[PDB]
C-alpha cells in the first residue's frame, strides 16, 4: 500500500445543502467519537469601526445562556456526556464545534442549533462579560507574538476592515450594548453563510436529517435589505515600530502580499516557505538543519525563534516571516532572511524544492490527523474554496511544483515588492524601511 494507494482511499467529504442554504458536510470513519461544529463566515473583516469587537462578544456569550437552556444547564448537558465544547473566532471565520462520542450525535447537533440561533444575550451577562474581555485584552497585550501580528495587520491593511483586530479596541468593547450584538447575530449568523461539519463516527444521512429537523428554522433573508457585501482590502506596504526597551526579546514580523484562498500559487509559495523552514532555540537540529536560515541562526545563536507564515484571506494574504531575537540580531536576520528569499527568487535548486514538497506533504497529511482537525478542515474549506480539497488533489498540485515554478512565483510575489514590517520591543537595530526595501531587490539579478 504505497502513498498514492492510501490517498485515493481516504473517505470522501459528502456535501449536502438544505433548502435554507445551510451546507451539511460529513466525513465518515470508524472512530467511536465525532466532532460536529458550525462554521460561520463572521469575523473582524465584516465589522465597521463602530461595532468592531461584536464577534468576540458574541462568541463569549454563546455558551453562557440560551432561550431553551437558561444558562449553566447547557454546560451541564455538555459535561454530562463528556463532550468538550469550544469556539474560535478569527478575522474571517467564527466556529463552534462539539467534541463528543458518536452516540451523542443527536444531542450535540441540537446543542449547536440552540447556540447558533436561540442565543439569549442577556444584558446582565453582557455586563459580566464586558469586564472579562477587558481583562483578556491586557492578557493579549502580554502576548507579544499576538500584538506583533495585530501590528502587522494594522500597518499592512491600513484603512480597511482587515486592519481591525478580532477582539476590538478597548473602547468599543466598553460600549457594545445588546442592540449592536443582535444586529451582528441577525446579519451574519445566516444559513447560507454557514457550514454544519462533522467528522468521525458520523453518518452523512444522520447529519442531514438532524440538520433538517433542527436548523430548518434558520433564515436566509437579510432583513429589510441590508446585505453586508465583501469589501476588497488594499495592502499598503508600510512599517510600524512600537519600541519598548524593557521587553527582554524583540519580535519582528515582515510580510509581503500573498495570494487569496483561490490562486493556486499558494501551493508553490508554501513549498518555498517550507524551504525557508522554521527554527526555535529548543530544536536540537543545531548547525545541521537543511534550512540555510535555521543553520545560520543555530550556528551564531542569532535568534530565539523564527517562523514563516502564509496567512491567507479571501482576496489577499500576508506571506512572510516572523522572528524573535535579541537586540543585536535584528538587522543580521534582516540580512539573512531577505537574503534567503531572493535566493529562491533567483536560484532555487531542484533538491531543495523536492525537500520542500516532502515537508509540505508531511504537514498536510499530519495536520489532518484526528477528528477535530478534520472537522476544522471541512468547515474552513467549504467557506474558503467552496469544496473540501481531497488529499489526492493536494498531491497532484504539489507534484506539479518544481524549481522553475517556485522561482517564478517567488519573483512574482517577493522580488521588488514593498514589505509590511512590524516590530516590537528593543527594535532599535531594526533596519530602516528604506534599507529593507533595498534588500527586497538584488543588484546581481
Amino acid at each position: 500500500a504505497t502513498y498514492a494507494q492510501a490517498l485515493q482511499s481516504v473517505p470522501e467529504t459528502q456535501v449536502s445543502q438544505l433548502d435554507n442554504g445551510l451546507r451539511v458536510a460529513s466525513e465518515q470513519s470508524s472512530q467511536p467519537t465525532c466532532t460536529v461544529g458550525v462554521w460561520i463566515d463572521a469575523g473582524s473583516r465584516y465589522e465597521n469601526e463602530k461595532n468592531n469587537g461584536a464577534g468576540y462578544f458574541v462568541e463569549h456569550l454563546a455558551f453562557k445562556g440560551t432561550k431553551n437552556r437558561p444558562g449553566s444547564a447547557l454546560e451541564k448537558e455538555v459535561e454530562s456526556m463528556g463532550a468538550h465544547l469550544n469556539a474560535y473566532s478569527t478575522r474571517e471565520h467564527t466556529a463552534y464545534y462539539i467534541k463528543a462520542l458518536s452516540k451523542d450525535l443527536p444531542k450535540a447537533v441540537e446543542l449547536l442549533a440552540d447556540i447558533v440561533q436561540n442565543c439569549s444575550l442577556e444584558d446582565s451577562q453582557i455586563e459580566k462579560e464586558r469586564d472579562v474581555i477587558l481583562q483578556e485584552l491586557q492578557e493579549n497585550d502580554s502576548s507579544m507574538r499576538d500584538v506583533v501580528f495585530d501590528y502587522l495587520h494594522a500597518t499592512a491593511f491600513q484603512g480597511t476592515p482587515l486592519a481591525q483586530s478580532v477582539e476590538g479596541p478597548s473602547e468599543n468593547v466598553r460600549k457594545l450594548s445588546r442592540a449592536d450584538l443582535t444586529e451582528y447575530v441577525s446579519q451574519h449568523y445566516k444559513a447560507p453563510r454557514m457550514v454544519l461539519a462533522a467528522a468521525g463516527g458520523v453518518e452523512h444521512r444522520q447529519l442531514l436529517d438532524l440538520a433538517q429537523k433542527h436548523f430548518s428554522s434558520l433564515s436566509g433573508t437579510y432583513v429589510e435589505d441590508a446585505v453586508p457585501a465583501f469589501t476588497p482590502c488594499r495592502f499598503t506596504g508600510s512599517e510600524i515600530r512600537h519600541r519598548d526597551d524593557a521587553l527582554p526579546l524583540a519580535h519582528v514580523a515582515i510580510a509581503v502580499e500573498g495570494p487569496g484562498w483561490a490562486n493556486p500559487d499558494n501551493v508553490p509559495l508554501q513549498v518555498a516557505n517550507a524551504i525557508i523552514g522554521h527554527y526555535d532555540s529548543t530544536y536540537g537540529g543545531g548547525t545541521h538543519m537543511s534550512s540555510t536560515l535555521a543553520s545560520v541562526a543555530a550556528t551564531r545563536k542569532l535568534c530565539q525563534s523564527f517562523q514563516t507564515f502564509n496567512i491567507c484571506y479571501a482576496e489577499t494574504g500576508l506571506l512572510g516571516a516572523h522572528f524573535v531575537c535579541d537586540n543585536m540580531s535584528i538587522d543580521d536576520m534582516m540580512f539573512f532572511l531577505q537574503g534567503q528569499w531572493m535566493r529562491l527568487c533567483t536560484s532555487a535548486t531542484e533538491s531543495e524544492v523536492v525537500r520542500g514538497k516532502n515537508i509540505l506533504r508531511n504537514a498536510l497529511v499530519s495536520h489532518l490527523d484526528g477528528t477535530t482537525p478534520v472537522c476544522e478542515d471541512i468547515g474552513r474549506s467549504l467557506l474558503t474554496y467552496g469544496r473540501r480539497i481531497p488529499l489526492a488533489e493536494w498531491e497532484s498540485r504539489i507534484a506539479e511544483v518544481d524549481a522553475s515554478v517556485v522561482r517564478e512565483v517567488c519573483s512574482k510575489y517577493f522580488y521588488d515588492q514593498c514589505p509590511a514590517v512590524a516590530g516590537l520591543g528593543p527594535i532599535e537595530q531594526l533596519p530602516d524601511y528604506n534599507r529593507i526595501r533595498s534588500g527586497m531587490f538584488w543588484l546581481r539579478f
Binding site: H242, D432, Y433, N434
Partner: protein
C-alpha cells in the same frame, strides 16, 4: 579688440558651448536628483509618531 580677446581666450567659443551643455545637463539632473532625494526621504517626511505611556 575682438582679435586680442580671441588671443587672450582662444577657448572662448568652446567655453561657452560647454557652458551651454552644462546648463542643460544641470537643468535636467538637479530636478531629477532632487526627486530621488525626496523619494528616499519621503519615508521620514511622512513619518508619524505616537506616545503611549502606561
Amino acid at each position: 579688440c575682438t582679435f586680442l580677446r580671441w588671443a587672450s581666450e582662444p577657448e572662448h567659443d568652446h567655453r561657452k558651448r560647454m557652458g551651454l551643455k552644462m546648463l542643460m545637463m544641470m537643468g535636467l539632473l538637479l530636478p531629477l536628483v532632487y526627486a530621488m532625494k525626496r523619494h528616499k526621504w519621503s519615508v521620514l517626511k511622512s513619518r508619524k509618531l505616537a506616545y503611549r505611556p502606561p
